[PDB]
Design a protein around this ligand. Structure first.
Ligand SMILES: O=P(O)(O)OC[C@H]1O[C@H](O)[C@H](O)[C@@H](O)[C@@H]1O
Lengths: 603, 33
């Protein structure tokens, strides 16, 4: 349909930078910036901190818009109209959530005669969400009123924080089509750990009882009310669609997976050039976390990657830890030269680094300095040998002075303690779920161990004394990115991995893994290993993961490169250009249901 | 009746009680989809 119309994207994460929803709408703006053109807007909360960074204020193009802001400006509502500085040119409608006094009390009671949902005063963002909810309905209401012969409106609502303002637009009966896109189910988060087998018992869960118990009923109601208030209910994931079918009680009309704007290069192999450059910087790290214990070959070594928020059960570290313990067995009982260095890049509270890790990094530069001094001494003696006209002796090249330097360097390198499992020093080391499991499974980064676990208790940075490499470079360095999960509504950690050339082990319970099962037919062949976690048990899932990990371990140099080239081809699948189609289809579907008079069925 | 709004405050809302969502779903149904 080509009809000229104005739509609004309503989210709390618009010009806030709080959650992952911000990152969704960051690159969504480009693809949605031509489908509806300049007519599309983004309704968001106003923060003075967010304005200095992201928002550049501008006047209204259309005279009807000028009055919508001015009429709203009267009556105590303040809008700072501006353009988002992010790529795409998104015109943002920042409503001040600070202006609580005019409508918080009156519209909260107005909310109760309409939706019959009450707001506790204790919960902070609860009172802030409803305010933002009425403010949206005001702007939409004025836009429909003051624009004579207003085209069919679409109100695109993201998260529970906007989910209240969904029902208000429907309650006024304002001519507006409505979309609710839940990026994560609210009650699903607490149900994931609190209730055993959440995915197995998704149908059984008493839907009102559980929310009341987690003192989160008011939030649950606002999101659930939003589903019955959108002609189109939308989930990011097909696994989240199953969640919503038995919890939110609304089947998602369309599943619109989140996407990334892939940073496409000039050479289609530049990712693999950035592989070797970043692998070397990881090689500088593991040639230093281990000094005097470097018996393993680092040219036959692999790097496994796992990242995200520090959630042991949700980000599925428990599955991956017991799997490396069995991968320890399979690469040791079998005569294998293959060593695997798994990196756990999950941020946690940490007072400072570890003396042994810092000493090892300093020793690595020391054995680089003592290998630069005698290298120059070799070089100078060679240059006066090449100039003289004689090839080097190769035995006298290094004097007794040089041999004593190198003999002492080796003597300082020697350590008896096994290289550390965690790079930094923790406040709660014994209470740490990852470190407790490591000492239990029996991987102390020993010489006998074919898998060495190197947890980095904080995010990677380029400005870091140890491991000076940023996250986007570090992913590209690692050979494989293993992401077992139980509650990843949309994998963003495994999603960004597949955007890069690195193959990622996703799961059936993850939003990314369900997407890869649906779109492409070939799982392991294209690179993305998918773990069955819905129809299996915790032990069974670990056993499948071992066979997946050992498959990558038994792979040759050349076969690894082919698979990494195949994973590059799947970047087009996660790009906003391809995955924006689904959102567009949601919009076209919304217009037709709410207003079939001039909108086609569009089957 | 205005008692239920106060009950909502302080999270005294009843999941299966007066504040039960089933009533809310019918209330949304008054504004038919
Ligand atoms: O990552 P591996 O399977 O060990 O292979 C290592 C290879 O990585 C990239 O493809 C580089 O361009 C090559 O120079 C290097 O030989």
């Amino acid at each position: 349909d080509l009809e000229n119309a104005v739509l609004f994207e309503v989210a709390w994460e618009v010009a806030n930078k709080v959650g992952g929803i911000y990152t969704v709408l960051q690159t969504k703006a480009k693809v949605t910036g031509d489908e509806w053109g300049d007519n599309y807007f983004l309704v968001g909360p106003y923060t003075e901190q967010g304005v200095r960074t992201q928002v550049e204020l501008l006047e209204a193009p259309t005279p009807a818009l000028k009055r919508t802001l001015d009429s709203m400006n009267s009556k105590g509502c303040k809008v700072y109209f501006g353009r988002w500085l992010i790529e795409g040119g998104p015109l943002v409608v920042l409503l001040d959530v600070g202006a609580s006094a005019w409508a918080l009390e009156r519209w909260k009671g107005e909310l109760w005669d309409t939706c019959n949902i009450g707001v506790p005063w204790y919960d902070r963002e609860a009172n802030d969400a409803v305010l933002f909810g009425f403010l949206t309905t005001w702007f939409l209401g004025e836009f429909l009123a003051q624009s004579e012969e207003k085209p069919h409106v679409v109100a695109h609502f993201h998260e529970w924080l906007a989910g209240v303002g969904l029902c208000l637009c429907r309650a006024r009966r304002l001519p507006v089509a409505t979309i609710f896109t839940t990026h994560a189910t609210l009650l699903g988060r607490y149900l994931c750990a609190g209730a055993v087998d959440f995915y197995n018992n998704l149908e059984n869960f008493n839907v009102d009882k559980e929310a009341g118990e987690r003192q989160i009923y008011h939030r649950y109601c606002m999101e659930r009310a939003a589903a019955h208030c959108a002609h189109v209910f939308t989930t990011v994931s097909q696994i989240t669609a199953i969640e919503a079918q038995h919890l939110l009680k609304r089947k998602p009309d369309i599943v619109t997976p989140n996407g990334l704007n892939v940073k496409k290069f000039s050479a289609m192999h530049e990712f693999q050039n950035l592989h070797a450059q970043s692998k070397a910087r990881i090689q500088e790290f593991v040639r230093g976390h281990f000094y005097g214990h470097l018996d393993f070959n680092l040219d036959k070594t692999l790097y496994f990657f796992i990242a995200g928020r520090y959630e042991f059960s949700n980000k599925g570290a428990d599955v991956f830890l017991e799997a490396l313990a069995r991968l320890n067995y399979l690469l040791r009982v079998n005569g294998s030269e293959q060593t695997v260095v798994a990196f756990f890049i999950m941020p946690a509270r940490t007072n400072n680094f570890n003396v042994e890790t810092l000493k090892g990094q300093a020793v690595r530069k020391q054995l680089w300095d003592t290998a630069n001094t005698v290298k120059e001494k070799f070089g100078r003696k060679l240059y006066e040998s090449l100039l003289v006209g004689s090839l080097p002796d190769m035995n006298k090249m290094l004097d007794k002075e040089d041999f004593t330097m190198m003999k002492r360097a080796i003597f300082a390198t020697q350590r008896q303690s096994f290289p550390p499992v965690c790079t930094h020093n923790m406040l709660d080391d014994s209470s740490d779920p990852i470190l407790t499991t490591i000492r239990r499974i029996g991987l102390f980064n020993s010489s006998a161990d074919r898998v060495k676990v190197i947890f980095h208790p904080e995010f990677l940075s380029s400005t870091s004394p140890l491991l000076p490499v940023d996250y986007e470079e570090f992913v590209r360095g690692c050979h494989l990115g293993v992401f077992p999960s139980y509650y990843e509504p949309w994998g963003y950690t495994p999603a960004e991995c597949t955007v890069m050339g690195i193959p990622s082990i996703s799961t059936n319970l993850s939003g990314f893994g369900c997407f890869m099962e649906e779109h492409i037919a070939d799982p392991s062949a294209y690179g993305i290993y998918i773990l069955d976690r819905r129809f299996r048990s915790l032990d069974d899932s670990c056993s499948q993961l071992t066979s997946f990990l050992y498959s990558f371990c038994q792979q040759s140099r050349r076969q690894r490169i082919i698979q990494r080239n195949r994973t590059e081809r799947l970047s087009d699948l996660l790009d906003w250009k391809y995955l924006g189609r689904y959102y567009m289809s949601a919009r076209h579907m919304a217009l037709s249901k709410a207003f079939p008079e001039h909108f086609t069925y569009e089957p | 009746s205005e008692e239920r709004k106060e009950r909502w405050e302080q999270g005294q809302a009843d999941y299966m009680g007066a504040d039960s969502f089933d009533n809310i779903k019918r209330k949304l149904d008054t504004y038919l989809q």
